[PDB]
Structure formats: C-alpha cells, structure tokens
Write a protein that binds this ligand. Structure first.
Ligand SMILES: [Ca+2]
Ligand SMILES: [Ca+2]
Ligand SMILES: [Ca+2]
Ligand SMILES: [Ca+2]
Lengths: 260, 395, 395, 260
C-alpha cells in the first residue's frame, strides 16, 4: 500500500527528522474552539494528527483524557459534529496524515462499515480502536481493507512474541508503542523490526521536549503526546487567546525535538 | 487444552485494550488448572461450608401467598456470611489469586457490597486488598467504608471525572493493566471480558446446584421455575446454571424497571437495549443513537448497571430464559410484604425477583405452581432507603 | 407428672406476685406437654433448619492465633437468621404460645435485638406482637424500631419512671398479669421466674448439641473448653447444656467488666455480687448494702444486666463452670482483631468471650489447646458504637 | 392470736363501720415531709396504715407508685430512715395498726430475721412482701411467727381454689384482695369465708369515695387506697401547705364512705 503516512515518513527520514503527532480529542471544549485547536496544531508544525472522538466510558484512558471526553460531551458533541470538523480540516490541509482514536461502540453502533465510510469521506487516514485487541480485530480489519483506511494497533511491551508478531502483520500506517523511555524499549523495537511492523511511534508519557529527543534516538520514527496537549486545553478553558498561544508554543518546542 | 470459549452466541468476548490481554490469558490458564486441582476444589468447599455457611436454607413461605395455590420457596442467600451471594465468587477468586502466587487484590465498588465482600475474603486469606470507590460514594457510604477499613482494606477514593462507580472501574482496570503481575482484579459480577463471565458462573454454581438437590428432597419434583434478579448477572446465572439442561424448568430473570420503562429511568437493557461493545464485552447496552452509553437507574444500587452478562443475553436469544421487569414500587411493595407476611427483610435487589413471583402467584391464584426466588441478599442495608421513600410519600 | 424443679441449688425460684402464679403454672404445664408432643419437636426443627438456618457453621480461625499452638473454633451463631442466637428460643416460645391457643405476644427490649427477634417470629407464625420499649431507647434506636414496625409489631414507648429498659419490663409484666389468658410473655433470656430459665435452656440446647457433634466429626475429640459471654445467660447455657455431663470439658463464661471492676461500672454480678431476690428469682445481684439494685454497665447493651440466670450461679457454686471478666477495651481489641485477622465482624457481646479466649491462647502460646468461642451474634449493629469510641480516642 | 388488727376490726364492726387504710410510701418525697404526711394521715381519721419502703425495681406496682419509690430514693431514703419514721409515729400513736408493703430483697439482704426484728422494734404490726407468693413463703413466714409479726398475703381473683385455700390458712391480720368493684368479687369472698381467711380488704382501684362505699357493701371489712393517696403527693410536690390540706380532706371524705 501507500497512504499519506508512507509519504510523510519518507519525506521525514529524507530530511532526517522524527514525527511529532499531537493528540487532541475532537470537540474539546466545544465545536467552534475545537476546530481552531486542530487548526493551530497543523499551523504550528504538526507532521500528523491523532484525534479522538468523544466517548461516554473511556475505560482505557487516564484522568486527563477522561476530563476531555467529558468536556466535549457536556457541550453536545456528536460523531456528526466530529466529521464536520475533520472535513473542514482536510479541505484546508490536504495530504496531512489524520488518525482517529476511537472506542469500539462508536463504530459498532450504527454499523461498522457505515461508520468507516463516514471517516474516509471526512478525509481520515487511520483508525485505532482502543478496546479491540489484535486477536479480535477480524471483523473490523476486513472492513478497513475494503474501504481503504489503515487499521492501527497498539504494541504493549509485555505481549507474547506470537501476539507481537501478529500486530506487526495486521498493522498499517504506524505502530503505537506503550514502551517508556526513562521488557526494555530497544528489545521491543528489535522484535518489531524483524517482523516488518509498520514504522514505530512512541506514545505513553511523552510530555516534555526532552522525552521527544530521547525518543527519535534509540530508533523510533516518531512520538505522540496525549495528555500533554490535552492538558493545555484543560488549564486555559476560560482564556481562549492564551490557550492557542500556549498551544502553538507547545507544538513548536515539541517539533524542534524531532530534528537531527 | 489451553483455551476456553469466550463467547455465548456472539455475546461476550474480550474487547479490552491490548495491554490487558496477557492478564486475561494468564487468569484463564490458572482458572483451568484450578478446576482440575482437587485440593483447590476441596479448599473451596470447606471455605463455603465451614466459613461462609453453605449450604444455605431453602425456606417455604407460609403466608405471603396463602390466598393462592402457589407453593413459593426462597433460596436463602441472605443467610450466607456477608449477607449476600457475592461472598461465594469472591472467596473463589481470592483463593484463585492466592495460588497464582499473588498477594495483592484490586477491586471497585459503588454501594459497598462488593467492597465489603472483597475485604473479608482478603482478610481471611491474608491478601492485601485495595478497593477503588467514587468520592461521592465514599461520602454516602460511611458505614460500609468503616467496615472495609476494619478488615484491613485500603479504600482509595477516586475524585477524577464523575467521581463515582464509572470512575472507580477506570482506576481499578488501569491499575490492573500496570500491576497484573503482582495483583489480581476481583470483578464484581458475571459480566466483562472473558474469562470473568465464565469464572463467576462456576463460583456461583452451587446456588442452583443446592436448590435442585434440596427441592428434590423437600417437595419431590423439580420446580416449575426459578426466579432471580439480574443486575450484572452474578446471582441469576448462579441459580440458572445447573437448571439449563433441565428442559422443563423455566428460567425467569427480573431486571429493574426503575421509575418505569416508559420514563427512561430504568436498568433493563436485556429487553430494552441495543447490542453494543462496552466494559470489555459485546452485550446489550442502554445507549443513544450515537453509541454513548446512557445512565441506568434502579432503587437498589446492585441493579444500577447499564449492561448485563453475556450468558444471559445468549439465554434470551435462544429462548431458554425469559426476562421480566419490576418497577421501584413493585419491589418496594414486595419488600414490605416479605417483612410482614414472612419474617425476612430482603435486599431491594432480591425484591425485584420476589415482586415478579408475587405476580405469577396472584395473577393465577387457583393454579398449582412451585416457584423459587433466589433471595440474593439481606435487606438491613436498605433499611435507611426504604424508610426515606416511605416517609417521602406517606409513612 | 405435673411439676418441674424450679431451683438450681437454692438459686432461681418463682418470686413473683401472686397474681402471676397461675400464668407461670399454666406456661409450665404447656411446656411439659410440648416437649412430649413429637409434632411440636419436628415443627421446631424444621423451623430452625429450613427457616432459621441451623445447623450453624463451626469455623476454624486461620490467623488470629497463628502465633500460638491454640486451635480456636467459632460457633457461628452470627450466621443464624436475625444475626444472633436469640432467634432460637424466640421461635420456640412463639411456637409454644401458638399451641396454648394464644394469638398475642408481649415482649420488652432495650437495644432492640430481642424486639426484632420477637417481631420476625410473630410475623412468620401469625401472632400479634406488642413490644414495650423505653422512650429514651426508642429515640436511640431508630433503625431497630423501623425494623420492628416493618414486620407488623406494635412498638409501645414507655415514658413513665426512668423511661428505659427497667420500665418496659414493668409494663410488659403488668400487661401479662392482666392478659395472660390471651397473651404470652416472651422473656428475653434464661433468667427470671421458673419455668423461664429452664425453657430458654431447652430452646438454646442445639447450640452445644451441634458443636459437640460437629467437633467430633471435625477434630475428633471433645474440645478442651467452650467459652461464651454471659449477660442474662441465654447463649452461654445454650452452649454449656450438652457439655455439662462431659466431665473433662471446661465451661468458661465471660461477664462484662465495663470500665473496670475496680471502677464500679461493670456488669459482672456472678463473681462480684451478693445473692438476692429480683426479677422474680433468687440469684446474684449488683446491690448496695441496703438491698437496692445497682446500675450495671457494659459497652455492649446485651450484657448490661445487673443479675444472671440461676443455672449459671449454680454451676459456679458447684465448681462445674468458671466465670471470667473482660473490660470494654479487651472486647474492643478482640472486636478489631476478628475483623482484621478473620473476616468476621462479631457482636460486642460475643467479643467478650473472644477476648478471653485470646488471653488463654497468648498467655500460653506453646500449649496445645482446642477452644470454642460461641459467636453469639453479628456485629453490624455495633458498627456505629465501635466507630465513635475509636474516634473519641484516636482513629 | 390477737394483734392490733383484731382490736380494730372488732371495735369497727361494733360501731358498724368499714376500715379505710391509706397507702403512702415512706420517705416520699423526703424524710421530713414524709413523717408529716404519715402524721396527717392518722389525724385525719385513718383506721390503719399501709406504708411502703422504697425499692429500686418495684416490678409489681403501677406508674403512680413507681414515681413515688423514685422520689424517696432520689432524696436518699434508707430502710434506717424508714424505721426512724415508723418509730416516731408509733411513739405518738400507740395501738394504731401499721403494715408494711415491702419487696423481698430489702428483707433478704442483711438477713430476714435481722430485718424482721427492726420492723417489730419500730412498732410494725404486719408485713406484705409483694414478690413472694404463698407457695414460696415458708422461709419468710416461719420467721414471721417467731418474731411476732403478721404475714399478709394477696388473694387475686384468679388463683386455684387450692391456692386460695392456702392463702386463707397462711394469712393473718387481714387479706389483701385484688378484686374490682365496678371471677366476680362476691364469689371470691365466699371461698375466703368458707376457708376462715383473715378479714378481707379491697385494694385495687379504690380512688373515689363511691368505690369505698360500694366496698363495705358486698361484704368487705375495709378498703385500701394506693395510687389515690400517693397521687396527691405527686401533684403538690412544690406546695407543702396545699399538699397536707388536700391530704387531710382526702382521708376525711374516704373515711366517711366507710360508715353505715
Ligand atoms: Ca446510575
Ligand atoms: Ca388472571
Ligand atoms: Ca445500664
Ligand atoms: Ca505466661
């Protein structure tokens, strides 16, 4: 295959840089401000986007992300409202990799393919379903290959070599790694490299620019910041102008840590 | 063999994040070895009998349905140690975690019933017990928090998010994600990801197993039906399990109707819910048109759960078991009746099953019927609740 | 035969006003006929087993005395229906009053335990139940009054005099004086006038009877001692009765020492009381030099009684049974220990017996010993009491 | 035998009148006022006295008498204090029948005979122990015949003819009857007359002068008022002068109902 991610990772290693992918949940804190948040994320130098769609019971996320699904739902955000934002973003920024972090019931209710079609029409490139493990992705992955969306899988550092091999083969776009920086991280990438997994990205606990620099080192194609980007939204809810500035500053300093 | 079926006719499964799969696989393998180890099975029985009080009585009511021809029996799980049926499967899981080599146990609770049951098991079996609890629930449950602390358990209030039971499950699960090598997670009901629905059934089996043998020795035949309330599914599958292969015994589960199904404030997804994926399982769900899970309601906290176990949803789609509803007022009136006619204060959870049995008796009072109600628990905990609802109306 | 001995070595008797003698004689004759009627004995057993939950477990503690060589067993009367041993003799007397042709039952209570037990028996056996209660006790026992009312009993507050338990006995007895032709008086313990001490013993016998047969099948020998708390004498004579003729089994009763015997605020007349005449019996009494009965004290209401049953005082003067004391703090620390080491919340009454057993174990930790503690009741009722005493000190 | 009662009942039927015997508990409400109460009872025309000694747990008495044992004990009354009052009364009023209403433990504690001796030394003529029935009076009655005090027994209307015969033979001084005015009362006296019981007196529920008049009629040697006399003390605790006047008036109007 060849998606927007393959174009990005080849352009990046050509320039010999790592990928910084911020995570922000769509509709947080409300629909109008959410688009401006996503807008400033791209303008401030994000290579790819990792956008969550608000769920009622995010049993896999920590408190910071939990408070952010709540903010969006309390304001009335709908999957429809999310596709409106995803559509308006890709209309402005073509060929910018956009992935979605979803919970399964948003996909299963109202039809798996029916939901997958709305994603591709909105310009989405990849989908990571948090509560669907690799050994139970068959129904979701088949539809993913028919519509043309890459299915992303999490590679936790304590799975079977059998399960870790299975994630390498089922994956596409990139591989989400729960390994920390500060089984060790290198020995995880070694198994993923031997099994031809998609390019690895680190996600868990990436908050400071230090952690990003020590993530492209030790051999990772990029790094995702979940809580660190959402927390800037949480701490500036009343102050729209300061929020976006603290946000643009965050993306620039985190992107600078992906060079060389 | 190193695998057990995770599905009940496309209900159930293991819809957890990848980080939790090795925890479930490990727990599955240990459970299979445990069911083969006979020293485990004997220690479980000596625990249920010499400590928990099994076998529990099978009482024949004398006055509540005297005006009818219905012979109504009560399986006395209120006489079990701890005052509820939960003690059964909590002793099993704790004993199971003890031979995985683990000393720690993670748990969550809302009303406090499961928390108290986990605490007393971990106290007897010398296990370090951490129970998560919503900060609002901690405030509303001073006696149950003091019970848990008296038995050496660490009560961890959860202040994030809604600060209630939905948030304690998040903490308990993420805790288990990081610490499953040293700690086990004692799931409270027969729902969630495999193998929890199967494990809880096997550790509540002796409910139905005792009734069948007790009813044969008492009345002579098998009962016409067994009735049990259905919150998550724990006590109902406990009763149904050994009766499933008895083709001429009806299985009736009663979900809470709350303030009325037409009012939306209920907890009956089995017959008013769209199938979805939640809590690591595929099962009926109280959800909106977009997929967000809706808030459930019942007068009894034990039934306030917007989903249901997988084997129950399966038993409904096969036609093996029928599931009914009982409103707050129907369970309240059944509560007050069992106090006045019999000498038993039932749990408001159990009163939903009783209220339905009172229907089957009073609707056909001249019909010869033999019914069993799984009295899942004592009602001393609901004394304050019943008194305030009665005073808010007229008592 | 139309007479049964009213004395235990010049202890006991029938020191009631003349107006009450025909009531006692009538109750005696009916009790003798009842013990000969076999349909009565079978209905009593089916009641205790299929309704009250007997036989109750005999638990072996695992951790509370692990640091010693003492094998410590608990007779699980907390698992009985109602949460205490009282249910046994209350079901018997109510069944006895039912075949005297009477439909009404008079009773009195202080904490509410006996009142609740009388209410649930009268509810099951369709008996009109009047319970007398001190107006101050009514105020302090809102949950227990609501329990009694939920089961159809008439709660009659007594405002005259001290307006407490001493005044409810006066009303209940004078009520029985006028109305013994239609009503029976369900005395709460194994004290008072004949034949009440003998009747209560025969309706609590199955405690010791079950332990003896359970201990033979479990450990193989008879226990070295059985330990039970002594308030009025009900649960202790229940345990002792079937062991009296086993010459090599010590019988230890534990009275409350309160804040200390040296402080005067205690409830141990058996070893610190002058023999006198009170409550219609001749027995040890907490009295002053003039004959006025003194106020007794215990942290548990069940042991706050300035006298004791006659058969106990007899068993002490013959050398058959030894009687000991336990202070508030010793029972409190035994309470907290059973919650933490075992998984059981004991009644503060029962904790006095347990605290003494913990003495016998820790004082000779290398001595091979086999001890039984009559766990007379559950501790959920004492949750509020223990929490306030702990917070008043440092918890 | 021949006690002060035999002298009184013969003098009364000679004058063809009934006996009015007020009941007051000794030491109520305090020691000094109690003697004045007993003093005014005799001066106002009482034929005999029925005096109770305060007990802690009077399980046989009603509320009115209960409140009166409490008043005396709260003020510090002792059996010693009672004998001081009994001694001072007989010193002033010789050959006036005085009976005591006691509970057994006051007698048994500190010795039965030892207590019975203090009574006779104080001038007491009779003793009724409320909580000692006839079939269990042997220890108490033997000592009563040795010291010379009459033992009084209550004749309730629902005892065995055997028990009712036994009370007739063990009795002395008079017989206390619990029979009401408004098995019937006449049929009770019939059995007591055939068994040569001591002269009968009615006690239960004698409050108004009407009830006294309808008590000497139907054949009774006298009548005792328990609660009615004590209640006058209860209703005038703060007012000493009104209490004694309402008391002297009560005795006179109740005594007038015993004539003819
Ligand atoms: Ca709810
Ligand atoms: Ca009909
Ligand atoms: Ca007291
Ligand atoms: Ca020693």
């Amino acid at each position: 295959m060849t998606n927007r991610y393959t174009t990005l990772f080849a352009n990046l290693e050509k320039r010999n840089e790592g990928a910084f992918i911020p995570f922000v949940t769509i509709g947080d804190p409300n629909k109008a401000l959410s688009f401006e948040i996503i807008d400033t994320l791209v303008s401030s130098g994000a290579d790819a986007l990792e956008l969550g769609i608000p769920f009622s019971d995010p049993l896999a996320d920590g408190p910071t992300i939990q408070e952010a699904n709540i903010r969006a739902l309390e304001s009335g955000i709908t999957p429809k409202d999310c596709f409106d934002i995803l559509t308006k973003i890709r209309a402005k920024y073509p060929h910018i990799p956009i992935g979605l972090l979803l919970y399964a019931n948003l996909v299963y209710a109202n039809g798996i393919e029916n939901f997958y079609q709305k994603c591709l029409d909105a310009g989405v490139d990849s989908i990571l379903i948090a509560d669907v493990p690799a050994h139970e992705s068959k129904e979701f992955r088949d539809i993913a290959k028919k519509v043309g969306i890459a299915q992303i899988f999490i590679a936790p550092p304590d799975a079977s070599e059998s399960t870790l091999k299975q994630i390498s083969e089922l994956g596409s776009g990139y591989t989400y790694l729960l390994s920390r920086v500060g089984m060790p991280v290198e020995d995880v990438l070694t198994k993923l490299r031997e099994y031809n997994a998609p390019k690895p990205v680190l996600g868990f606990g990436i908050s400071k620019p230090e952690q990003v620099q020590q993530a492209i080192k030790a051999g990772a194609a990029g790094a995702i910041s979940g809580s660190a980007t959402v927390k800037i939204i949480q701490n500036n809810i009343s102050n729209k102008q300061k929020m976006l500035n603290e946000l643009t500053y965050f993306v620039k300093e985190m992107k600078a840590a992906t060079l060389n | 063999m190193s695998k057990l079926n995770a599905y009940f006719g496309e209900y159930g499964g293991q819809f957890v994040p990848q980080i939790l799969v090795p925890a479930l696989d490990q727990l599955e393998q240990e459970f299979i070895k445990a069911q083969a180890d006979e020293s485990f099975k004997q220690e479980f029985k000596e625990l249920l009998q010499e400590y928990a009080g099994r076998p529990t009585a099978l009482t024949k009511t004398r006055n509540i349905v005297k005006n009818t021809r219905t012979k109504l029996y009560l399986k006395r799980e209120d006489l079990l140690h701890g005052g509820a049926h939960k003690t059964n499967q909590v002793l099993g899981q704790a004993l199971l975690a003890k031979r995985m080599g683990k000393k720690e146990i993670i748990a969550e609770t809302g009303a406090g019933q499961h928390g108290v049951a986990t605490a007393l098991a971990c106290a007897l079996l010398d296990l370090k017990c951490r129970v998560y609890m919503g900060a609002k629930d901690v405030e509303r449950q001073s006696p149950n928090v003091f019970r848990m602390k008296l038995m050496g358990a660490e009560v961890i209030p959860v202040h994030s998010g809604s600060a209630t039971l939905k948030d304690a499950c998040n903490e308990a699960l993420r805790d288990w994600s990081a610490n499953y090598s040293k700690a086990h997670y004692l799931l409270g009901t027969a729902a969630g990801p495999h193998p929890f629905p199967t494990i809880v059934r096997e550790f509540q089996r002796m409910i139905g197993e005792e009734t069948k043998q007790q009813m044969l020795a008492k009345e002579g035949r098998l009962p016409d039906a067994v009735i049990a309330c259905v919150g998550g599914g724990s006590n109902a599958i406990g009763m149904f399990a050994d009766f499933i292969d008895e083709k001429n015994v009806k299985l009736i589960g009663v979900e809470p109707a709350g303030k009325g199904i037409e009012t939306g404030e209920h907890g009956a997804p089995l017959k008013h819910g769209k199938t979805g994926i939640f809590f690591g399982m595929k099962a009926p769900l109280m959800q909106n048109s977009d997929g967000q899970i809706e808030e459930s309601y019942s007068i009894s906290a034990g039934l306030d759960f917007p989903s249901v176990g997988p084997q129950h949803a399966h038993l409904l789609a096969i036609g093996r078991a029928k599931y009914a509803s009982a409103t707050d007022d129907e369970a309240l009136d059944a509560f007050k009746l069992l106090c006045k006619k019999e000498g038993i204060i039932p749990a408001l959870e159990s009163s939903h099953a009783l209220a339905h049995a009172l229907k089957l008796a009073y609707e056909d009072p001249n019909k010869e019927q033999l019914l069993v109600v799984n009295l899942s628990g004592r009602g001393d905990k609901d004394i304050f609740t019943v008194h305030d609802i009665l005073k808010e109306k007229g008592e």
